[PDB]
Enzyme design. Sequence first.
Site, mmCIF file in Angstrom:
data_model
loop_
_atom_site.group_PDB
_atom_site.id
_atom_site.type_symbol
_atom_site.label_atom_id
_atom_site.label_comp_id
_atom_site.label_asym_id
_atom_site.label_seq_id
_atom_site.Cartn_x
_atom_site.Cartn_y
_atom_site.Cartn_z
ATOM 1 N N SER A 21 1.417 -3.406 3.795
ATOM 2 C CA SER A 21 1.606 -4.785 4.211
ATOM 3 C C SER A 21 1.122 -5.711 3.112
ATOM 4 O O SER A 21 0.269 -5.346 2.305
ATOM 5 C CB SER A 21 0.871 -5.075 5.521
ATOM 6 N N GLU A 26 -5.480 -3.664 -6.718
ATOM 7 C CA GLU A 26 -5.735 -4.343 -5.449
ATOM 8 C C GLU A 26 -6.738 -5.478 -5.660
ATOM 9 O O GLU A 26 -7.734 -5.296 -6.357
ATOM 10 C CB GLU A 26 -6.299 -3.371 -4.421
ATOM 11 N N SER A 44 0.793 -1.223 0.000
ATOM 12 C CA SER A 44 0.000 0.000 0.000
ATOM 13 C C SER A 44 0.827 1.276 0.000
ATOM 14 O O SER A 44 0.236 2.356 -0.100
ATOM 15 C CB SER A 44 -0.946 0.016 1.193
#
Length: 261
Positions: free
Chosen positions: A210, A139, A43
């Site tokens: 993460s 994502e 991110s």
Amino acid sequence: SAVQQKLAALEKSSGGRLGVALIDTADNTQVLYRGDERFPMCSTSKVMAAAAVLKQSETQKQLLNQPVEIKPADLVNYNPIAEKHVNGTMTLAELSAAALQYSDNTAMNKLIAQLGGPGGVTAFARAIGDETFRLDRTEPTLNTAIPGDPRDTTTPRAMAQTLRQLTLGHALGETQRAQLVTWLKGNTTGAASIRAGLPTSWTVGDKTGSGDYGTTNDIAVIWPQGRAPLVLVTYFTQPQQNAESRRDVLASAARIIAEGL
Ligand SMILES: [K+]
């Protein structure tokens, strides 16, 4: 003093692979550890996407107020803000703030789509002089963090240089730079990472990341008490696909850097 020895020792104790890049803007000195190795950004790439949309808004002057539809099928794996607005809309400013301050992955995907796909984020990186950054996927798959995979990676050196240009230099217009800095300073996810290794009196704006392989990242601009700002990137990844997060390693790296400073 002995910063290289200490960072190497921290990495060995951690069992993983640590990348550090510091820029001290007081004198332009640097501390680098695996500074030219690629790491999965996870991110932390949201900074580049938000900044790219900020740059677009320098010439599409009302872009940040443009509504974007949030549909049930758009929700991915971590959507703390977007899930509140499903079947409605959010503005690009609201999506930028959600991405940066809550690490909302649906918000990221809307930023990526506004830029025309992951290649649009990379193109902005190239436009501000970053020849190393690459965004390849949306994502959540940009977080797979597979060892040796160059997709969705950058180097600590390149990311620190870019974060300096975005937050302290002139890659963005004045209002847009201030907006990025305001967003980073309001991050909600950062107290266990770089911030935890620094004196509490210092002002920090950061973006965490993460992913798989216990990847644990943080990129920060730091205003120490009474001196010029620092830029610090701490990237960390581990040998086991299902490894636990290790934000303490990032705090330990920051604490070493603040000692040798
Ligand atoms: K993880």
